[PDB]
Amino acid sequence: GSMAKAAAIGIDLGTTYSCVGVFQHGKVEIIANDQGNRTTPSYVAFTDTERLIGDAAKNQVALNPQNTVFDAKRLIGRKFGDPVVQSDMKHWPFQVINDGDKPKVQVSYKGETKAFYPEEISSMVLTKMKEIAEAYLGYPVTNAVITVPAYFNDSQRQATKDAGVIAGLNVLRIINEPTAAAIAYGLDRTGKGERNVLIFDLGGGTFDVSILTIDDGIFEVKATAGDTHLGGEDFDNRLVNHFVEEFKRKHKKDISQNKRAVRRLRTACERAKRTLSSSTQASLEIDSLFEGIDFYTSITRARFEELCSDLFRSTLEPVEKALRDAKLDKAQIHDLVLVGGSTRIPKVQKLLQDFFNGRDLNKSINPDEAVAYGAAVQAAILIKSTRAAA
Ligand SMILES: Nc1ncnc2c1nc(Br)n2[C@@H]1O[C@H](CO)[C@@H](O)[C@H]1O
Ligand SMILES: [Mg+2]
């Protein structure tokens, strides 16, 4: 008769990390990769012998910075001359070249110099997400919903579809990341009447606020605001500068010129930062950090909060701006949704909850998984082909 259909997948193709989910048995499963990670770095590395994608690429970045590509989403669908591109290039260790006013990343790969369009790098990340899903499902996957930022234009959306097509995926639809996070909570399933939803998305490197209106399951983007210079990496930087100063006071040594020591410090700082989201203090223990000196210390959540205090407070400026743009008052927002791992920070949650006069925040779906979750819900809806009964 009719052979069972393969499940369709939802992919959050993120700037720093990507996530894949599948809706089955009335629920979403966020799929872990083979290293047990529920999110996969959006990284691709090139060597003389291999092309590594995800954790394998990110884990070898220290010694191969010129041939490990990340942040391709910041280049996707943009012109080489775009001022965003020109500024971002100064921070990247890999080469970005100009091919007819279109940026390409240029690397050493399998004995040759090779250049790739941003959509080709993103297709490599999408190929890894498809394989992660296929390892769990136990069969080939064809259909996917891929998400993008609400501010992406036509060129950026088409280049994302192109990345999916290069990866061998049939792209069912390109949907906005804030819309997918709202779908994850079933905010489009509450019946008739308008609901105003604010999505608070704090990433590794950028912060996005979106205001959506949902009426009878129909989404309208009312306002977008944010800060391109606010993310998790800025909190890691504050901890790095703090501990560099601490080592100077305690051992009368400046470690800041040994890249390995700084990198080991930053890696430890990011993990201590994550621990501080669940505990009121966290230890930092690095053996032979610099000149054979063991660095065994601690940091309280209160000190970390003081170190990043201005940065956390600045998340409320784009919230106020988005509300003015949407012509809405804070009391008129029905739902608050958290997106991004950095939203697990208790102080970030408290500042936003206090701003909205004590309101509950939707954070029950892991914030680094909500976008893929919503994309998986939509992918299952889009492949339905029910024929009406008489
Ligand atoms: N529990 C957590 N508490 C604080 N921060 C976190 C947590 N989990 C994640 Br994930 N992050 C940060 O989210 C960003 C994602 O690119 C990175 O800056 C991560 O450090
Ligand atoms: Mg995201």
Side-chain angles (χ1 to χ4, degrees), residues 1-2 4 6-26 28-101 103-113 115-191 193-221 223-247 249-349 351-362 364-383 385-390:
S2 181
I9 60 173
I11 307 171
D12 166 10
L13 176 63
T15 307
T16 66
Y17 283 91
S18 290
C19 186
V20 63
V22 62
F23 183 92
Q24 286 190 123
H25 321 289
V28 171
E29 177 73 13
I30 290 306
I31 309 169
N33 63 28
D34 60 22
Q35 293 190 30
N37 306 308
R38 295 169 67 91
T39 67
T40 296
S42 301
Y43 277 60
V44 182
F46 302 91
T47 76
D48 181 60
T49 58
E50 298 178 290
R51 179 187 80 187
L52 307 170
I53 307 160
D55 295 298
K58 185 160 171 287
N59 294 353
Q60 58 79 76
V61 72
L63 294 187
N64 194 22
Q66 295 187 305
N67 309 296
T68 306
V69 179
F70 60 89
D71 273 355
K73 187 163 171 183
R74 294 192 73 55
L75 291 178
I76 211 155
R78 298 189 180 275
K79 299 173 179 289
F80 182 83
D82 186 323
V84 167
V85 174
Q86 284 313 310
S87 184
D88 293 349
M89 278 171 62
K90 311 287 228 297
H91 294 281
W92 297 322
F94 51 83
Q95 198 171 38
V96 178
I97 70 170
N98 186 7
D99 190 313
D101 199 28
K104 299 192 75 171
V105 299
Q106 184 167 263
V107 297
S108 284
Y109 176 45
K110 289 181 163 113
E112 283 185 30
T113 295
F116 296 100
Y117 287 107
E119 57 267 32
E120 290 182 286
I121 298 297
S122 287
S123 80
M124 292 166 195
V125 172
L126 295 170
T127 295
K128 177 64 168 180
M129 303 323 290
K130 183 179 189 285
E131 290 168 357
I132 285 160
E134 287 170 343
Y136 169 70
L137 294 169
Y139 52 74
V141 170
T142 288
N143 302 298
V145 161
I146 303 160
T147 56
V148 297
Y151 59 78
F152 262 24
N153 63 32
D154 290 344
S155 171
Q156 290 171 298
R157 288 168 196 271
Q158 182 59 59
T160 301
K161 288 181 187 178
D162 291 352
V165 178
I166 296 165
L169 287 166
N170 171 59
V171 181
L172 298 167
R173 200 80 165 94
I174 292 297
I175 70 163
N176 294 334
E177 284 156 22
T179 295
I183 289 167
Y185 285 95
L187 302 183
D188 61 331
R189 287 194 273 110
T190 82
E194 281 201 315
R195 277 190 98 88
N196 302 303
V197 180
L198 188 145
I199 313 287
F200 184 94
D201 194 340
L202 186 55
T206 67
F207 172 53
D208 294 306
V209 171
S210 305
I211 297 175
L212 311 178
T213 56
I214 321 164
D215 188 7
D216 228 348
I218 303 301
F219 286 90
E220 183 190 337
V221 176
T224 63
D227 190 331
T228 51
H229 288 71
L230 185 62
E233 78 180 272
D234 300 298
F235 314 145
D236 297 343
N237 288 340
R238 294 285 178 87
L239 281 164
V240 169
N241 296 336
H242 166 73
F243 287 123
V244 162
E245 185 190 299
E246 190 182 288
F247 199 94
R249 193 177 316 268
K250 171 81 193 163
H251 305 286
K252 323 276 180 292
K253 299 278 180 177
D254 181 8
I255 69 146
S256 71
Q257 297 321 115
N258 187 289
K259 302 278 171 285
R260 190 172 167 256
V262 173
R263 189 175 58 247
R264 282 177 84 218
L265 187 53
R266 187 163 269 109
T267 290
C269 283
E270 189 278 345
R271 289 181 211 289
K273 177 189 76 183
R274 296 209 192 201
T275 304
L276 293 170
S277 290
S278 337
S279 304
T280 57
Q281 66 286 320
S283 278
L284 203 313
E285 290 154 4
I286 305 170
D287 282 36
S288 182
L289 177 60
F290 187 77
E291 292 196 15
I293 304 148
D294 295 336
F295 192 52
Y296 272 37
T297 191
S298 70
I299 182 137
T300 65
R301 173 196 291 171
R303 186 55 177 129
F304 168 66
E305 283 170 354
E306 182 183 58
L307 285 165
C308 306
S309 60
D310 55 302
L311 299 171
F312 297 163
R313 284 280 273 255
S314 74
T315 64
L316 299 176
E317 267 72 89
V319 173
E320 300 178 280
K321 191 199 188 208
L323 286 162
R324 287 193 294 273
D325 284 12
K327 309 200 189 292
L328 295 170
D329 273 320
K330 45 200 198 170
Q332 287 174 281
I333 296 309
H334 303 80
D335 317 294
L336 294 170
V337 174
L338 300 183
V339 177
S342 301
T343 68
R344 294 196 196 265
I345 300 167
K347 183 63 180 192
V348 172
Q349 283 179 27
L351 282 168
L352 180 70
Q353 176 169 67
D354 284 352
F355 181 84
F356 282 96
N357 312 110
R359 206 97 64 74
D360 174 65
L361 310 178
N362 290 291
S364 61
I365 294 166
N366 291 336
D368 56 346
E369 300 177 5
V371 169
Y373 190 121
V377 172
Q378 206 52 35
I381 289 169
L382 290 168
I383 67 167
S385 69
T386 316
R387 288 158 179 203

